[PDB]
Amino acid sequence: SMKLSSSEKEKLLKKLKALGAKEEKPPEHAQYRLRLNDAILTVYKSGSVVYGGKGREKLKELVAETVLSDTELPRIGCNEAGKGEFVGPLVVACIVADEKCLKRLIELGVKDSKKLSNEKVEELASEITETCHGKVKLLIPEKYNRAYSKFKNINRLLEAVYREIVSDLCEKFSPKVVVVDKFSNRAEEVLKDVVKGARLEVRPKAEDDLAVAAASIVAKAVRLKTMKELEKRFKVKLPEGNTGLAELLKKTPKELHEKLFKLHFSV
RNA sequence: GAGUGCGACACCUGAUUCC
DNA sequence: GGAATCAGGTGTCGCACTC
Ligand SMILES: [Mg+2]
């Protein structure tokens, strides 16, 4: 389920009441629950909005209208995966959302990839990339390790990667807003001068933004796909996160380390 | 030692909808 | 009994940064 902002929750509630919806007793941690005919809408205090009952089409459209009314388009959301994992690639993804893309993300109930299973992520990423334009920078470990040699700091590397993608996408698409996770204290500073006239937002919990969340899903799916390829390529079994790393280091032939791991890590 | 942000991974428990 | 959605919480492992 997607996450509504504070203003959207309030505007959605008013809108649904204004066309007759009946308030019902909300479940634990929910803000409100409305019935419209036989369709149920539940909005959690977190902002997550959940459809229930039957004939959910009218509810879905009303939510879409609400989110569309206060979301400036076109916009870009930016996110990375594989940053803190010793094994496998670093992936930076940016998604450009126009109206058709935004409506799609809403329909899909898109949210932060951290809250999604692997199968859900792969499924959603293909739905996303079928509708939205975007750009992905993939750094498999062999490439990552070379890039890291020049930067000697992951934030500096991330800055360079984001700066290039965002600059190119802004020149091409000229969005009204650019939103990105605060991945370093210097990220705003680096991105400020490549976004042209767009409003730039660098902030924590950036995945509350639909386009940022869509980007987290794409970046994560690219990582998962690459992890599988690395496994078949080097005939090795790999953990998606940081588990069993000391043993994995010993098990893995030394000449494959630069091809599988982020060597600068101390694990 | 304690935090913040980013990246995760692995679990527990409760609620809701539909069949 | 099955599919799914949400929420509150626990632990572990990394890079960067602050006190
Ligand atoms: Mg991410």
Residue numbers in the entry: 0 to 266
The authors write:
Two structural classes of RNases H are designated H1 and H2, and the latter is further divided into RNases H2 and H3 (1,2). Despite the similarity to RNase H2, the type 3 enzyme exhibits the biochemical properties of RNase H1. The RNase H3 N-domain enhances substrate binding and is important for the in vivo function of the enzyme.
Here, we describe the structure of RNase H3 from T. ammonificans complexed with an RNA/DNA hybrid. The best crystals were obtained for Ta-RNase H3 in complex with a 19-mer RNA/DNA and diffracted X-rays to 2.1 Å resolution. The scissile phosphate is located at the active site of the enzyme composed of four carboxylates: Asp78 (replaced in the crystallized protein with Asn to inactivate the enzyme), Glu79, Asp180 and Glu206. One metal ion, refined as Mg2+, is observed at the active site, corresponding to metal ion A. It exhibits regular octahedral coordination with six ligands: pro-Sp non-bridging oxygen of the phosphate group of nt 7, pro-Rp oxygen of nt 8, backbone carbonyl of Gly79, side chain of Asn78 and two water molecules. Therefore, the structure implies that by combining the interactions with the 2′-OH and stacking of aromatic rings with deoxyriboses of the DNA, a relatively small N-domain can achieve specific binding of an RNA/DNA hybrid.
